[PDB]
Every structure is written in C-alpha cells, then in structure tokens.
Amino acid sequence: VSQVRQNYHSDCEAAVNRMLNLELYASYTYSSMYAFFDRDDVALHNVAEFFKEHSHEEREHAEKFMKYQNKRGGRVVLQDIKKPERDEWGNTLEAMQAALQLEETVNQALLDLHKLATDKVDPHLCDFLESEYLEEQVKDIKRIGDFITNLKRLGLPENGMGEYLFDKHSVKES
C-alpha cells in the first residue's frame, strides 16, 4: 500500500485508469477528425484546427488523471488506445454530430465516476470531477450543440456554401 494512500478505494483507482483511457481514446478520435478536414478534398482548415485543439485538450485531461492517480497513491495502468470508429467523417455536420456523441459518452463516464466516488465516500474525488471536468464538459457539449443547430440552419449536408461559411465564421480563424 502506498504511504500516501488514504480514503482511496480500489474501485475508484481502477475507474480512474479507465477514464484516463477514455480521454486518450477521445483525443485520438479528434485527431482523426483534424486529419480528415485537412485533406485536399475536404479542405476546411478552421474546422480541422478546432478538432486538433480538442484533441490536445483531451490529452491534457488524460494527463491530469495520471497526476491525480499518483497524488492519491493509486497506480497508473495503461491499456491500448483504440482507433476511432470511422476512418472518414463525411462532412462538418456528421463530424460535429459524432463529437457531440463522444462528449456525451465522456460526460456519462465522468458522471458514473462521480456516482462511484459518492458511493465510496470520497469527497476529494468528487471535488476533482466537479472542479476540473463536469462544468467544462457541459460547456463543450453546449458549444457543439450550438454548432449543430447552425450547420442545420446553413443547409448541411447539401449546402456547400453553408459549410464554407461555417468554417469562416463559427470556428476561430486559424
């Protein structure tokens, strides 16, 4: 047993490792989206850079779980990072719809971990999730939902001019 370990349940330790893996998985999916939108036959570079930044964010969130695990005296255990579900992402609407689902999946895992931390009476883990994850998750989901509404408004998937304009005006110029 680690000399620092206190009030840290084995189940929470294991769930933190799973959460670490899921954040790496999410980062990898966003990287795939980046590379798709960077293609010469897709060529929406502001959308591409949005996904690249989100890939970096998810990787940072993985690293935070690693640091957390060690702070509590748990032990980081890594597994394979599964490739993304798709090799190509259709268009900006399809990608953002997939991003929404991914954020919802990550959010459910965070909420499930909070339930487990609550069940095991671990307020430090509860605080960690609430302070570092749950609100930024809600913000990201809201942003992507807002995007989807605008892409539909712009006539995606059929309206290429709409898709062009989204890339110029809804995501930051890169």
Q: Does 157 bind a copy of itself (CB under 8 A)?
A: no
The residue count for binding a copy of itself (CB under 8 A) is: 82
CA distance 9 to 139: 30
DSSP-assigned letter for residue 85: S
φ/ψ region of 43 (left if φ > 0, alpha if ψ in -120 to 50, else beta) reads left
Helix-then-strand count for the chain, H and E: 6, 0
111 binds a copy of itself (CB under 8 A): yes
Which residues 8-27 are close enough to bind Mg ion by CB under 5 A? Answer: 10
Please choose, out of 6-14, 32-40, 47-55, 96-104, the segment that lies near Cl ion by the rule CB under 5 A: 6-14
Structure tokens at 103: 């954020």
- In the chain, the amino acid numbered 11 is D
Distance CA 24, CA 62 (A): 6
Q: Would you say 6 is a known binding-site residue?
A: no
Q: Which residue has the tokens 């992402």?
A: 89
Residue 6 or 10 with smaller CB distance to Mg ion: 10
Residues of this chain, 26-45, that bind Mg ion according to CB under 5 A = none
Q: 125-144: which residues touch a copy of itself (CB under 8 A)?
A: 126-131, 134-135, 138-139, 141-142
Gap between the Cα atoms of 12 and 114, Å rounded: 9
Find the binder of Cl ion among 21, 31, 55, 69 (CB under 5 A): 21
* Residue 140, contacted partner among Mg ion, Cl ion, a copy of itself, none, CB below 5-8 A by kind: Mg ion
Q: What is the closest distance, in whole angstroms, from the C-beta atom of residue 94 to a copy of itself in the complex?
A: 15
Backbone angles phi, psi at 140, to 5 degrees: -65, -40
Which residues sit at the interface with Cl ion, rule CB under 5 A?
Answer: 5, 7-10, 18, 21, 43, 79, 86-88, 91, 111, 135-136, 146, 150, 155, 159, 170
